[PDB]
Design a protein around this nucleic acid. Structure first.
Ligand SMILES: [Mg+2]
Ligand SMILES: [Mg+2]
Ligand SMILES: [Mg+2]
Ligand SMILES: [Mg+2]
Ligand SMILES: [Mg+2]
Ligand SMILES: [Mg+2]
Ligand SMILES: [Mg+2]
Ligand SMILES: [Mg+2]
Ligand SMILES: [Mg+2]
Ligand SMILES: [Mg+2]
Ligand SMILES: [Mg+2]
Ligand SMILES: [Mg+2]
Ligand SMILES: [Mg+2]
Ligand SMILES: [Mg+2]
Ligand SMILES: [Mg+2]
Ligand SMILES: [Mg+2]
Ligand SMILES: [Mg+2]
Ligand SMILES: [Mg+2]
Ligand SMILES: [Mg+2]
Ligand SMILES: [Mg+2]
Ligand SMILES: [Mg+2]
Ligand SMILES: [Mg+2]
Lengths: 225, 128, 53, 187, 147, 136
RNA sequence: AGAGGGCGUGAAACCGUUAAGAGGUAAACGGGUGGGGUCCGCGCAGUCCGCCCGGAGGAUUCAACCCGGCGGCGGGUCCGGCCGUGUCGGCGGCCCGGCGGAUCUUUCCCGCGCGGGGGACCGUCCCCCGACCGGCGACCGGCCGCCGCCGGGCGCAUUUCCA
RNA sequence: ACCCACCCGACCCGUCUUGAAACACGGACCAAGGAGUCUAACACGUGCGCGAGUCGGGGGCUCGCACGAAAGCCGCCGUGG
RNA sequence: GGAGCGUCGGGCCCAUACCCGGCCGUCGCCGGCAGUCGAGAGUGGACGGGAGCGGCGGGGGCGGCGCGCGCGCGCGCCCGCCCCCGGAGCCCCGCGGACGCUACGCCGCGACGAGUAGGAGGGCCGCUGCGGUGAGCCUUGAAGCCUAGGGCGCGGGCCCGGG
């Protein structure tokens, strides 16, 4: 009875420890690949332009896939069409933000909420800093902080997304499984903008903070994240 | 060398002053005893700046130290000797108050019994 | 005034009815009195059926 | 400040039974435990029903229990009913059944047992089958109560067939202006 | 139990649950069924269709016992008799058929709802339905009129 | 049963005593004075109760038979233990643990006995400790 | 009489005084500190206790062990007997087992086709023993194992008490 | 928690009102009193008992009622609803 | 030579808003706990013959389904064992189970919290009387009254000291 079972339980124990090691190693290599993937993406955009510039030509790079959208005014006296879209972006509180994949449908929904949001095209670093510092899962409808990959995996592992790093790659490249990785993320509760804003009520173009500021959404991210 | 309680944490109180009743100051007919105002205009009941405060469940005590005396115990109002022997197995967490209406002969009888069982008494040196 | 569904009902408390309310606090005292009186009548009609005719 | 409506945040379902009776409450203690520790959703359904009102757990007639077990395949099983099992005088031949009920009326009890039927209590059902395996979970007709005949699109609202609350039926209790065509109109 | 009622919980509050714009005045509608035609009409003619108006024939000295005729359905006719009449029958082998005096049990009419078990009877009754008759015959029995 | 009669009793018994945000229970053979299911003398088929000895020296353990409750006269069975503290506990320990009787209780039964043997501490010694009584 | 003839208790408004404190934006109020008072808890070191251990002093009988007695628990062989559930056998209680029935019979009896009582019949409730099974907190008796108490044994590298 | 000081805050409540610190009314102060009741009828909800039934009244049988003008029982158990 | 007006910088100031943390409550979780292994769980266990360093010689996949804390192993001596928790000594224990379990109890995770009229829930809030119950309290002083005394409660209120 006894020594047979004990060894069986020790065997079990080991087979777990082995698997843990394995999945860890996968995670480690998956990152290493994504490091090489982002490098390759960055260079091969510059590569292109230089080559257009060598000819009397132009390289118009791709219009952006993905944008971060911060709600920059409050929750009083807000029109019903705006209000609905703002709760279709999950931007309920002021200074909540979400990633948002762009397309004719999506962009126009941002057009209907323009003077209620600041938004634009996040950096790589922005996607990291938001995910690591303020990455919270939706896990049985309980906002829970992504303390381990056992959380991400448990939920998103049916998509091939098994770690924080995978998540970041799904969000940033806007993969197949974006909708499901992006919805998994609870909307980002960011603090107030350190150093202040310019003007809440007016558009970026015209001095204020609202609307599309494209590249410059990253500065705002750093002073709020 | 008094009876120490088992655990003597820091009690920490959210509000110390009594909430008093609006215009209890101005009138002898109104008593301090809190009453929520129900007046249609009422500085207080609509939470203006500079007014008397309204009690909420917000001010509530921490559950660890709710009803905890300064000494660290909770009271338990003992009425005669037999009623003490309850506390026998607590003593480190509950003390014994003796009642006002108890006579100065059997007040004494309680106190010495509690002293055997090491139950702390909260009004012993008194009737005499 | 009626409010959303119910029997359009007619109570008969328009006369001065509280002047003619008839309570039943008697009834136990009554029930006994009859019963005594009954047992007395038996005893009077000595071997005759208590019933009657 | 956040925008949510706090309007339907509190779900209104029951948690315990509203009754204070001690035997039912023991059944609840038993089926809470089973509900939580078994995978059987039978236990959950049963548990849910123990908290419901008299109205909400209507009586299941013997004839209704017969015909529901007459159905093809649920043969050599046990019927379960969180309500009561009543007689049907308008059924005669009663097959030998297996039954669970909180109550069974004295007639219904005789008829079943005379047939060679077994009657079970709910504590007994649990020991017999803690995961509800091989059970027929029935229910009495919820919308039996005469109550419901007054519910719906009101009377005097075209194409409603909704009993009005009337002191007494008869020639001259309603049936004038608003039912006859001869008298005003009709709905 | 006043203890449980609502006025205990209203203590302190001004209006006593009747509001302060409009109040609790005495009889704002009119007393009772006032305004059945005017000013309460909608309630009357959407929850009491047919209150107003005469209909049908008067009948002066109605006496209910003349029209007394309590019915019973075939559904539960065998209920009137002891099970051991319905048992000593589907047995016996004489083809007897036991009597069921329905008027004894307090029903005058025999109407015809329900399936009657294939087991002959003699039903004595004051009145019968057409269908109740037919069903009874189909079982292999005989309806019997009584005064 | 045990549970059924606990349903009858839980809030109503004469032995219970609420007041001052606590609750308690005064029924005999309840070590820990709790109005609990576990710690209730009257309800359970097997019961433990550790009272002090009437002598003033020592402790009594109070088992309940199982033989026949219905007959309370015969139901409980008392046993004085008047031994060297450390021993007393062990005898109670074995009574409880090695008889497989009310195993749930047992540590509570030890602490009770312990507290009782504390009680029979010295009253005179306590008086000396509280007041220095030096130089008036 | 800090119960004095409208006198038990003797609240508040209001007044007198005594003590303390303040004082040109009517007072009063909320929040926040400070100062002073009133008492209350101390300490004439509060270094607070409790386990276990090591050493150092002092003192009673043990524990460990057997032996004798008592009591308790738990157990299976269900061993032997009482106990009761489901089933089967006795048709055995059935008339020495009663009620109920629109089941039957007026072969019966009694009273006047009906009432009462028998007599069949059915449904229900009780005796006899055997067998199987749930051996069920429903109990006893022996045997076993374990526990506890008392007394016997054990006098001291032990087991206690105390500092 | 008694008093005083100081900084900041701070208009008088009740009420009708779209709007009350209002040049809108009521209010010198304190004590005691003081206003959603009971009956009947309906409806829905909930709890319990019994369930094709259910029912209790009214009446009666059991006691001088200490507790009783209760409690119990009734081929009335169902005339009847 | 702005403390004005028009255009613009840095910098700093603070709301009950935003972020982090504490504490109270409410809602939600098919929430957990009536006593058990187990953290992307992706089995466990008979039992029979045949055998053994064999294994299941499958993707630059970057990997999840299979591998390097053992499967067989050290001991008794190629053969036997691979044994029992009344004792593995324990990070898991399926033999028994809280310090915890008033199961109307206890515990864990999230989220949220303006409010007239109005609605509902809970009040170990409060008053007076009745059935029960506290081997309650009371001339060794009840009720009430008063108190710059000590406390509890978010609060309704409450408890103690003195008079
Ligand atoms: Mg605005
Ligand atoms: Mg604007
Ligand atoms: Mg207003
Ligand atoms: Mg007569
Ligand atoms: Mg709200
Ligand atoms: Mg209202
Ligand atoms: Mg009003
Ligand atoms: Mg109105
Ligand atoms: Mg006097
Ligand atoms: Mg006087
Ligand atoms: Mg007097
Ligand atoms: Mg002075
Ligand atoms: Mg007006
Ligand atoms: Mg006006
Ligand atoms: Mg006003
Ligand atoms: Mg003016
Ligand atoms: Mg006016
Ligand atoms: Mg005036
Ligand atoms: Mg008053
Ligand atoms: Mg109802
Ligand atoms: Mg609120
Ligand atoms: Mg209100």
């Amino acid at each position: 009875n006894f020594a047979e079972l004990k060894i069986k339980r020790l065997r079990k124990k080991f087979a777990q420890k082995m698997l843990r090691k394995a999945r860890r190693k996968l995670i480690y290599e998956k990152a290493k690949h994504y490091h090489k993937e982002y490098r390759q993406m960055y260079r091969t955009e510059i590569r292109m332009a230089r080559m257009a510039r060598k000819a009397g030509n132009f390289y118009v790079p791709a219009e952006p896939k993905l944008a971060f959208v911060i709600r920059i005014r409050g929750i009083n006296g807000v029109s019903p069409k705006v209000r609905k879209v703002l709760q279709l972006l999950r931007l309920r509180q002021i200074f909540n933000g979400t990633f948002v994949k762009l397309n004719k449908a999506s962009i126009n929904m941002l057009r209907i909420v323009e003077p209620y949001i600041a938004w634009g095209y996040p950096n790589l670093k922005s996607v990291n800093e938001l995910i690591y510092k303020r990455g919270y899962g939706k896990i049985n409808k309980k906002r829970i902080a992504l303390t381990d990959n056992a959380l991400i995996a448990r939920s998103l592992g049916k998509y091939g997304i098994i770690c924080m790093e995978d998540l970041i790659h799904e969000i940033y490249t806007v993969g197949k499984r974006f909708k499901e990785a992006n919805n998994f993320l609870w909307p980002f509760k960011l603090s107030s903008p350190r150093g202040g804003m310019k003007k809440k009520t007016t558009h970026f173009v015209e001095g204020e903070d609202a609307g599309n500021r494209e590249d410059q959404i990253n500065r705002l991210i750093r002073r709020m994240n | 060398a008094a009876l120490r309680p088992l655990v003597k944490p820091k009690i920490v109180k959210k509000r110390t002053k009594k909430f008093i009743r609006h215009q209890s100051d101005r009138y002898v007919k109104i008593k301090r005893n809190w009453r929520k105002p129900r007046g249609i205009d009422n500085r207080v009941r609509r939470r203006f700046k500079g007014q008397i405060l309204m009690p909420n469940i917000g001010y509530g005590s921490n559950k660890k130290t709710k009803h905890m005396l300064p000494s660290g115990f909770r009271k338990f109002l003992v009425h005669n000797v037999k009623e003490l022997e309850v506390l026998l197995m607590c003593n480190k967490s509950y003390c014994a108050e003796i009642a006002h209406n108890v006579s100065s002969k059997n007040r004494k009888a309680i106190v010495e019994r509690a002293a055997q069982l090491a139950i702390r008494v909260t009004n012993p040196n008194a009737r005499l | 005034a009626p409010s959303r569904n119910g029997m359009i009902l007619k109570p008969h408390f328009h006369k001065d009815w509280q002047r003619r309310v008839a309570t039943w606090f008697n009834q136990p005292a009554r029930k006994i009195r009859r019963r005594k009186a009954r047992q007395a009548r038996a005893r009077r009609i000595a071997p005759r059926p208590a019933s009657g005719p | 400040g956040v925008d949510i409506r706090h309007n339907k945040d509190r779900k209104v379902r029951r948690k315990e039974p509203k009754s204070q009776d001690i035997y039912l409450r023991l059944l609840v203690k038993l089926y809470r435990f089973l509900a939580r520790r078994t995978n059987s959703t039978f236990n959950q359904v049963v548990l849910k029903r123990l908290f419901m009102s008299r109205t909400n757990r209507p009586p299941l007639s013997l004839s209704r229990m017969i015909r529901k077990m007459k159905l093809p395949g649920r043969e050599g099983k046990t019927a379960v009913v969180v309500g009561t099992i009543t007689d049907d005088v308008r059924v005669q031949e009663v097959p030998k059944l297996k039954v669970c009920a909180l109550r069974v009326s004295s007639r219904a009890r005789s008829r079943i047992l005379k047939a060679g039927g077994k009657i079970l209590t709910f504590d007994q059902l649990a020991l017999d089958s803690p995961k509800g395996c091989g059970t027929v979970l029935l229910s009495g007709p919820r919308k039996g109560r005469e109550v419901y005949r007054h519910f719906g699109k009101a009377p005097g609202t075209p194409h409603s067939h909704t009993k009005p609350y009337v002191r007494s039926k008869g020639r001259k209790f309603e049936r004038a202006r608003g039912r006859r065509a001869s008298r005003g109109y009709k709905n | 139990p006043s203890r449980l009622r609502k006025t205990r919980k209203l203590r302190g509050h001004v209006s006593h649950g009747h509001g302060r714009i409009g109040k609790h005045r005495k009889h704002p509608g009119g007393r009772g069924n006032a305004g059945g035609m005017h000013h309460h009409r909608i309630n009357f003619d959407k929850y009491h269709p047919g209150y107003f108006g005469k209909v049908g024939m008067r009948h002066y000295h109605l006496k209910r016992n003349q029209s007394f005729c309590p019915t019973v359905n075939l559904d539960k006719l065998w209920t009137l008799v002891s099970e051991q009449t319905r048992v000593n029958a589907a047995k016996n082998k004489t083809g007897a058929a036991p009597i069921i005096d329905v008027v004894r049990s307090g029903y005058y009419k025999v109407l015809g709802k329900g399936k009657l078990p294939k087991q002959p009877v003699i039903v004595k009754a004051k009145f019968f339905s057409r269908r109740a008759e037919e069903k009874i015959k189909g079982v292999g029995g005989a309806c019997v009129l009584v005064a | 049963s045990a549970h059924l009669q606990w349903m009858v009793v839980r809030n109503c018994s004469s032995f219970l005593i609420k007041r001052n945000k606590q609750t308690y229970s005064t029924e005999p053979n309840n070590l820990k004075a709790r109005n609990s299911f576990r710690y209730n003398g009257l309800i359970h088929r097997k019961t433990v109760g550790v009272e002090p000895a009437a002598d003033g020296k020592g402790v009594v353990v109070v088992m309940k038979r199982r033989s026949g409750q219905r007959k309370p006269a015969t139901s409980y069975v008392r046993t004085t233990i008047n031994k060297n503290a450390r021993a007393t506990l062990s005898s109670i320990r074995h009574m409880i643990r090695k008889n497989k009787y009310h195993p749930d209780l047992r540590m509570a039964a030890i602490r009770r006995a312990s507290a009782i043997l504390r009680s029979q501490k010295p009253v005179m010694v306590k008086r000396k400790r509280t007041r220095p009584t030096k130089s008036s």
